[PDB]
């Protein structure tokens, strides 16, 4: 598992181009540390956990430690 730090606030309800993003993409504020498992997928998203919840994370919003 790798840690990424959020560089931006992200609210998938209002900011995701995916109409399903609200249930499947993780919500985060700047400075949040995300548990990412595996590698970036073909779509550009990581798989991870934050505050006990799992979902997808856009790579252009986070930076690997």
């Amino acid at each position: 598992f790798r840690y990424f730090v959020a560089m931006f606030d992200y609210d998938p309800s209002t900011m995701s181009p995916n109409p399903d993003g609200c249930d499947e993409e993780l919500p985060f504020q700047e400075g949040d540390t995300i548990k990412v498992f595996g590698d970036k997928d073909a779509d550009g998203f990581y798989w991870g956990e934050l505050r006990g919840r799992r979902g997808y994370v856009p790579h252009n919003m986070v930076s690997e430690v």
Binding site: M7, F8, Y10, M15, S16, P17, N18, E30, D41, A42, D43, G44, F45, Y56, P58, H59, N60, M61
Partner: peptide
């Protein structure tokens, strides 16, 4: 397939 949100303005 799954789409990325736009990369915004500036880092912090």
């Amino acid at each position: 397939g799954r789409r990325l949100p736009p990369t915004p303005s500036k880092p912090s």
